[PDB]
Design an enzyme around this catalytic site. Sequence first.
Site, PDB file in Angstrom:
ATOM      1  N   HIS A 134       0.842  -1.184   0.000  1.00  0.00           N
ATOM      2  CA  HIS A 134       0.000   0.000   0.000  1.00  0.00           C
ATOM      3  C   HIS A 134       0.880   1.238   0.000  1.00  0.00           C
ATOM      4  CE1 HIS A 134       1.014   0.165   4.228  1.00  0.00           C
ATOM      5  NE2 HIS A 134       0.398   1.326   4.333  1.00  0.00           N
ATOM      6  N   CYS A 190      -0.108   2.046  -7.199  1.00  0.00           N
ATOM      7  CA  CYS A 190      -0.907   2.706  -6.175  1.00  0.00           C
ATOM      8  C   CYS A 190      -0.226   3.950  -5.628  1.00  0.00           C
ATOM      9  CB  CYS A 190      -1.233   1.737  -5.037  1.00  0.00           C
ATOM     10  SG  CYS A 190       0.156   1.153  -4.070  1.00  0.00           S
TER      11      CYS A 190
END
Length: 1214
Positions: free
Chosen positions: A976, A1124
């Site tokens: 992430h 991301c």
Amino acid sequence: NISDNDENILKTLIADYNLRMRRDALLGELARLDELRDISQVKGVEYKVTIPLLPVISTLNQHEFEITQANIETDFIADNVTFVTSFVPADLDLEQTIQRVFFRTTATTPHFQSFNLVIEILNYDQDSGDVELHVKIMIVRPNSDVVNYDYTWIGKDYERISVCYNLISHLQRIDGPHGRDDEAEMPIYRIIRRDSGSIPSYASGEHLYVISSHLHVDEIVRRREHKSISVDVTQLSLILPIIRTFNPVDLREVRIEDITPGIEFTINMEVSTYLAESSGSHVDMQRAIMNHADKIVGNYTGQQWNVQSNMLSEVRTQMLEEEDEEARQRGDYTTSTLVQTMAQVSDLFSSTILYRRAEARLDNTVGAFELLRPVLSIPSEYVHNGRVGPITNIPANASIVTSSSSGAGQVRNIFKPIGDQTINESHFANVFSNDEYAIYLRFSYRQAPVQSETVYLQQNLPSMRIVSPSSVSTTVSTAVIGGNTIHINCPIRPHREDRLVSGGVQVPRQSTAVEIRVQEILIGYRQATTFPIDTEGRLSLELMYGLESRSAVGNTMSPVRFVTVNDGEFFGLTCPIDLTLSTVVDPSSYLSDGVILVATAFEDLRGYAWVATLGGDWPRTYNSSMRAFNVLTGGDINLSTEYGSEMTYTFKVELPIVYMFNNMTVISNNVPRVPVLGVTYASIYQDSRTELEARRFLQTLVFRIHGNWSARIPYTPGNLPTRNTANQHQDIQQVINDSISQELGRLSDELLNMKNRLDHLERQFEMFIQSQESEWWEILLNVVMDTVLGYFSTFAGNALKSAQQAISKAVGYTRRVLMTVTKTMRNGPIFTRLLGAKNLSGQALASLETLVESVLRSINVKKSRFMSGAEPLYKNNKVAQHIDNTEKMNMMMDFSFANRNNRQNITADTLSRMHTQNAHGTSDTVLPAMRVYYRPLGFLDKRVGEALHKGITRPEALKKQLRSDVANVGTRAPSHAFMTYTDVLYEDAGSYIVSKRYLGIGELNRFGRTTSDKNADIGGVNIKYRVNKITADGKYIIDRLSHTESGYTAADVDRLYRSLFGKQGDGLSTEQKWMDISRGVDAKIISADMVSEEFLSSKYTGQMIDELINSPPQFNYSLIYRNCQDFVLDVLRVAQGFSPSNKWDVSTAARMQQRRVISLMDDLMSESETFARSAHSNHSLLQQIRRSYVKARKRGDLHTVKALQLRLKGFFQI
């Protein structure tokens, strides 16, 4: 069934399969099964949508951890800090003797002293990597209790094992208040970490566990169907922080001693931004610990899913390109050359030198200068015939034998220094420093030993000597005529069975020849660039050392230029004083006391001994010396004997002076003298001495100075600043900051009035708008007016983007806005020196100016109407800090330093150590950090490699290397990325609201065409705190607010918990869910990477971000972005004042712009109650106006639209 053509098709399909098998066998042993790899990737995606985003954890390797320890100088305590030892068997270096991880702490901790880990490979078939491991963990408790843990594992070459050790420190209690800080209008609390009379504040625990996995790749290949990976966590130890104890774990005190190359080791800490009290409830503490553990395990599982996918078939990755260091270097070098050319141009200007009057009086001051060594002299060839002496501590019990029966031998000691003891030196003694000038005393020192007699005092209780054995020699056989054969076995300290290694020697003393000769005393001014003139004054100097003293007076002073060894050259005036202090008559007068020791104690000498036999068949002389002693200490330790009826045992130690003086103590502090002329102790003389009093007596030179002087100090020439920038800048940021500092003087001081500043900024904005070729400003004004009156347009985002592009293209306008902000704030120059190597970014300031100006032009009011109140204005106007850059900067500086920035004449160097943040290092930003974090958790981003083996290679080694390559390439991507934005609100005298906004996004899918319940998604929250309390060290203490005070309902909290933790919190109330969410965001980003920009936060940019957090768009990130990290980089760009991404849909930026304008308009209407009313500005009347406006706009009615715009404008007139 089928025809002949169908049979031919089937045969060619079979042939194609055979060709595929041929290719696969040509490539090697690894499997190539595309369907199974695809199923593995899809199942890995399905798992990965569940990895938690929170808590926030920072990962460091050993190098970055050491740099971070060096960066932080205050208390450095983490709520959770996990030491993960991770390894892949195919990556271990098998030529190493041992696979080990060892690390310890140098201080006292409730649970931890040292951690040791060893990996043993019981079996390893490298053709088909089948490993059998045994891991042994040893933990030593502070009371020297050893705890052993075992772990065995049978598996594959390419699978990962992680041993995670968490040290937990919870702040559970603050005691107070103990007063009231007056600069920061807050009560004062203390935080007790050390043994004292107060109750301890921290509770500590530990958590130890192992993570293992099985990727059933062999079974999947054999059966040709997928099988999910299986991850096992083994709990080894869990101690909850139940009771409060002293000495929590400080990370500055942790040492990583040895890690075998090939083993990965990371430090994963979560350190709070400010100090906060934990919950004492047991279930809450356990959830706090297990959230940390669960995030680590989730990241491990995602990585192992990647490894399984890569093992099942070929996966290709492009590695992100790294920024060009060399092109950036050429650009920066061109800029620096241009600055050098500008300096050459400015060197053409010459002017007359102008002076100023300087007078200064030097009060009675005391300063102490310590020589390199204590003033001693060791005589050569010192012989001592006793049983106990400088070297030996042999009890009379000890068995010592000679050739004759029952004949005790006599021992003697010989001590010999090796080398010169004369020293010639010249020093620049520090006297006094000030922001104007600095005073240094210049002198020279002479030393040499003079022919005299030795003085040796032996202790009644002697310290553990190097030679203190139980017995020296024994008789093995006795002969009637020849004599008794003797065997000598004399060990040296430490003994084989011993604790606390120790040993030493006592040193004989002599008398030396001291000659201190002071030549002059010098003073220099910081800003003087040439010799001063009209130099007059008088100075008195008093020398004193040992028992002697001198004094002399200097009258004449002359302009001087001198160079110090740390600060550079100074210009000033010198006061020659010619005195000499010589204690050659009494250099040795500490004779009352005066034992001198030298410590020689080493791990490597344990068990060493003199072992020899003497007698009939054996030689009659012994002469041996320890060579390990020479290796450690550049000297000798020796024992010599002669076989006979009467025997002497010579124990000689022969040390060099440097080793002696780096290892000595000055015990016999029982009769310490006093400073020769009754001077107060100077914090280097018995000021918490702890046995350091005799060395200070023999080493420290102390002096007393008083006088006054007067001279004319030249001003710096006006052409100097550009030459200074060319001569001493290091970076381009330094060039920019120097230009800002010099331009601060060009601007008029009329800008220090609010009306003049507002007029100046309005004129700047009019210049900016009048120079636009396209008419985007008029359409922007129409959009803003419609937004204010309730009609929400789809291309408000386009208007916003055009405005941001115009601002980023007009760098002169941004520079002028930044310059006026730096000029009109309190202590602008102090701030520019506070920045250090960073620059303040002016894009956000100009963005705020444009937004505010847009709304004000829409409602047809000047900004001065909203800026009324007493000073400081942000404390008396509730909108001033939100619409003004200068008041925002003032408020933020008062917050960041707790009003220590408002002290008179405080320097930026002193102020830089008064920040209110927890674990704040000077390499951190003054304003709150605002950046994107994207790094893996629990393992490194690269593998530690090996060099190619020098021998002849063999096939199973090649297979092992290919397996390691496939297990490591492309599998270590972070799971992430995230970004944090924080804004601060002033509400009362000692009350602030800190508003932290978190935005994160999970790793993007390999297959993105699926539905949104299986794609990567974003997760965000806005969390608030209140600052009411401060510690006695100047750091804020936080109280966290509830979910209602942050604007969230129970259903909102359920949705947030699902987004941020990847699960429905089952059995948790909304209070527990909010506790977890709020506590998981307060962690701080710890890194060794340095940012070079400062950014000012605003309330309306925060509203723009909340628009994403609260109503996220329907977006497929997996199909649009490659990464991301790119999404959060786009969001951070918007937060920094730049334009929105063209990847987004139109309505995203549209809604953002609407939110910022609506928020500003609400603030302005609330403020306008002072110069308007509330009866005619009621929410019910404005709602009716907005509904009428929307209806009129949707049917093209210009009359009603104009009428309603006039009604809104008239709200602000009366």
